[PDB]
Amino acid sequence: KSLKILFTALFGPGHLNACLGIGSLLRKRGHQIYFAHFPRHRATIEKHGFLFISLLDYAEPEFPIVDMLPDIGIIAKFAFERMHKLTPLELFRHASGKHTFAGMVNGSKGENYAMMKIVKEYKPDVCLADYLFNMPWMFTVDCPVIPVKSVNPIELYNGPPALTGCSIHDPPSVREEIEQLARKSELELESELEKLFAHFNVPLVSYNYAQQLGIYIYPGPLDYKELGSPKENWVRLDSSIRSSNFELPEKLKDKPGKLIYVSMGSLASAVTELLTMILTPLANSPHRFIVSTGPNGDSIKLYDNMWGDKFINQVALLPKVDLFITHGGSNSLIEGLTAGKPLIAIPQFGDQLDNAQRIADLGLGVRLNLHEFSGEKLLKAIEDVLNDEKINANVARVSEELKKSDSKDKVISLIEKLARDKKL
Ligand SMILES: O=c1ccn([C@@H]2O[C@H](COP(=O)(O)OP(=O)(O)O)[C@@H](O)[C@H]2O)c(=O)[nH]1
Ligand SMILES: O=c1c(O)c(-c2ccc(O)c(O)c2)oc2cc(O)cc(O)c12
């Protein structure tokens, strides 16, 4: 029996891209996939064979729906300026118990109204949604809803607080304070969600509760097995890659060195100062760089050893590079490791700090922090990682694991079962 499956996600292309991958698996099984998201992604969604639904067409008049990607960058400038000078601890101190994505909770009412209307009209058998936190509609619509998580999944475990970037090597005395601050700001997230749920008259749940089934996308070899098991009803999908041939810019043909990809993500690349800071020293690195220059890419200066465009084909490119300098977004991490490339992660915000530290902790690359950044340090990191026989072997081992994953079969079966039975 072929199902009607409805997806949605946050604005961020990181979240959209994770769901595209799951959607593709379900489409292959014979299901009709709908995806409710913003008009800028209609092409990718429809190219995947999914029916596009504009959340903008379902908005209530008193509660409009910004697609925030254009507004982000204005926000991200402030974030960059703080972390570039403050240590993570000082950042948490300066935050004064303000949570990372709490300010986003209030603004989510409009998207909630839209989803209630969409689900009522389209009457799917099941929904999947990739958000930073649970939303009231997920508990009021008349079908099972599965949260999809693509951020670092330490939040699903009972060990160190998420978003702090703690290392397995940090001793008790060092984490005590950052863990107090993290726990304090978690209370702000709860109080913000209380207001949102109260608005819609829905009983409050944990921000990462999965009623029946939740799917987190993270490579099994990097998952937090040393913390036991994730929260109830959460199941791991080892990767989610949406899924062709790529040709190398002639600029970089017959230049010396390895090929290195630089991308600071979809969100953070908006901030031109960040890329400028990073690329400046790389002019003197004896290698060839392909750069994702972001929305404001045209005014970024590139050197003789660099070719860039606003938006690059990351999945096509990665097999052809030797190293990936990344902000440490989850998707980028999964794509880089699938391709078997080592990582230099320069975390900017949120879960990236957790991913960056996990890369370091498991010998898959190095973390560099903004606050102590130097061109000397970066160039050395490049040479070190390129010639570190241990890191490359670890990456090759994880790369092999990721390719042979059969997590998809189990997860699909669960999705199908839940849709049909309405329970378990
Ligand atoms: O030039 C670019 C920049 C980004 N991406 C894609 O954008 C997503 C970025 O997600 P991630 O979690 O790594 O970063 P974030 O979006 O959270 O900044 C991934 O699917 C990348 O493949 C891409 O295809 N080309
Ligand atoms: O505080 C905010 C925040 O943390 C994030 C965020 C964090 C991590 C992510 O991975 C992500 O996609 C978004 O977005 C925002 C977007 C806004 O318009 C306003 C905000 O205040 C935030």
UniProtKB/TrEMBL annotation:
Binding residues annotated for UDP-alpha-D-glucose, in chain numbering: G14, S292, I312, H327, S330, N331, S332, E335, D351, Q352
Query: Keyword set for this entry?
Result: Glycosyltransferase, Membrane, Nucleotide-binding, Transferase, Transmembrane, Transmembrane helix
Query: InterPro entries, from UniProt?
Result: UDP-glycosyltransferase (IPR050271), UDP_glucos_trans (IPR002213)
The transmembrane segments are 5-26
Q: Do you know which SUPFAM superfamilies this protein is assigned to?
A: UDP-Glycosyltransferase/glycogen phosphorylase
Could you tell me which Pfam families the record lists for this protein?
UDPGT (PF00201)
**What residues bind UDP, as annotated?**
N17, R242, S266, L267, S292, F311, I312, Q314, H327, S330, N331, S332, E335
- Listed GO MF terms: nucleotide binding; UDP-glycosyltransferase activity
The similarity annotation says: Belongs to the UDP-glycosyltransferase family.
What's the protein called, per UniProt?
Answer: UDP-glycosyltransferase 202A2
Q: Which organism is it from?
A: Tetranychus urticae
